[PDB]
Design a protein around this ligand. Sequence first.
Ligand SMILES: O=C(Cc1cccc(Cl)c1)Nc1cccc2[nH]ncc12
Ligand SMILES: O=C(Cc1cccc(Cl)c1)Nc1cccc2[nH]ncc12
Lengths: 304, 304
Amino acid sequence: SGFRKMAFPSGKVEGCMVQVTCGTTTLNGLWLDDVVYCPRHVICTSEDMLNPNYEDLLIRKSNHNFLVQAGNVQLRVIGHSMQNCVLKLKVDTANPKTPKYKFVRIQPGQTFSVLACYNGSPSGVYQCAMRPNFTIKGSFLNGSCGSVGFNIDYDCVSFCYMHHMELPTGVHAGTDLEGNFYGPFVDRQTAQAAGTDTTITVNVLAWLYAAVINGDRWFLNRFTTTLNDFNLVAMKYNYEPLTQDHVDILGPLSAQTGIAVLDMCASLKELLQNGMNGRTILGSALLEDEFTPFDVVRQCSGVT
Amino acid sequence: SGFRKMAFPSGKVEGCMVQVTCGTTTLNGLWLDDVVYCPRHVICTSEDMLNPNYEDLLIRKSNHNFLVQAGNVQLRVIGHSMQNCVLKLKVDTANPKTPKYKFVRIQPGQTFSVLACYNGSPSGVYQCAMRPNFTIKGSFLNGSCGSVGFNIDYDCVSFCYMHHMELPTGVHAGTDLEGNFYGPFVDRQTAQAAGTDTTITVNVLAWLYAAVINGDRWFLNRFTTTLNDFNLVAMKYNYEPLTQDHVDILGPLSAQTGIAVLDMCASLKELLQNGMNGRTILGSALLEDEFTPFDVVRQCSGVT
Ligand SMILES: O=C(Cc1cccc(Cl)c1)Nc1cccc2[nH]ncc12
Ligand SMILES: O=C(Cc1cccc(Cl)c1)Nc1cccc2[nH]ncc12
């Protein structure tokens, strides 16, 4: 028992990290097979970042201008192309450490692990959620661009995020591995509105089920609610409206604990209306929304 | 910017994990050079666990009774010995993935990463603290015994913990890599008192400095305090007494922010006496003590 904000083991991703330098800029790249993926802003100088003309900046670059280093060994670049906001550097050697992998575009409210890197070297790993507004609240310093987010299903790494930018608000924005930003963001040094965010209701409910499984039960009450009534409360408290699709994904946790989803909704309703009263749930004094129902089941069943 | 409960990249440790089976019991082992380390209770049956006679149980075992499997390949066991609460299984092949490593006994209040494993396969990685009472609040299910805790300083893995037991209270106990338990625990299925725990004051202060560095400043006040006055408050709130040694380790963070350690102590004093008033610090609604001053500097400087 016990419940932690657990990340996937990062080894399979550590073996893919490289350093990419173009001119004066260094960031991280992801080496899979014979391609290195990295943020296209590796080609910018500070003078360029207010609104870079990426097409023109890339025309001034040749294969030999992209310095790619995998630990201590240099990779030979034999092609380059820009796809949306990523560059794809074709190299003459397939990464021997390439794991089985997929590129996936995750949905808002889903979670993933981030391997924060600097100069192609891994620094640390943490778990986070893609907010409903498509930002991430990460831990990224200058030089972390090109670090990736991923999930692992047995031996397959599904890469879902590449880090590109820290907005002036201190929240993070990035792309899928085809270089499409999550959210409305653009790769320019400008203030950019991130939408209104909401709390991921189905994840808070999953975490309340994790709490019951792991011994924290004080918040269970004698009440029930309906989706309509619960959604009036979710509206007031800026929580995502709950749907039958969310109730269905909570089915396994409802079956494991014997607590009907709408009864757990009534516990969440009381917690939203009354607060925690100075108590904690799974070591937290707030309602946690960074665990999906799949994460809770995986953590409570010991999936490897 | 941003601050997360970050674990070390686990790849170097993933390469050391093996499955050890003895009779009907399977758990995890750590393969370094030509030795596999695992909890000695791998030799017990359920009938043995109330108070096992480990010496007698191990006398009934031969090298060929210890089944060690590294992924899909079987290791040949050419020796066995019990050291405190660990078994050391000498194998005929040095682990090719053995990283540079050390065995260290950590101090209470220090932090480390855990690579939770089942059947020798990594499941996930998380960061935690060794409580002042020598327990850990982990995420461990049955089959996780033998999972290890570690820190990494550049290319060297310092292994500090091997998981052995979940106490009836749901908290975790284990040993250093020489098999000495942290705390008063014994490897038997009995209720065992864990001491009175306290909050790790120097880590809460480090985390308040991380909060100021990362933009959360609302808790800064016009006050100062002394070590004596602060320690009266720490006493009331079950916090570890602060010493000049703790003030000295907070020196770098004090220099980075320009906030004297005793002024930060006055902010912590007000937070202990008044609570958070429904506000958060670094996404937490409680005072976090699982980040050391070294962790805060490492995370805020991008060490790889
Ligand atoms: O965000 C950027 C580069 C950049 C600026 C504008 C647009 C783009 Cl696409 C890229 N550098 C950072 C500086 C400081 C902390 C940081 N955390 N994560 C990144 C990061
Ligand atoms: O703790 C043990 C085995 C054991 C019992 C008594 C003494 C010893 Cl040394 C070992 N099994 C577990 C069962 C369920 C969840 C668990 N989490 N971590 C372990 C764990």
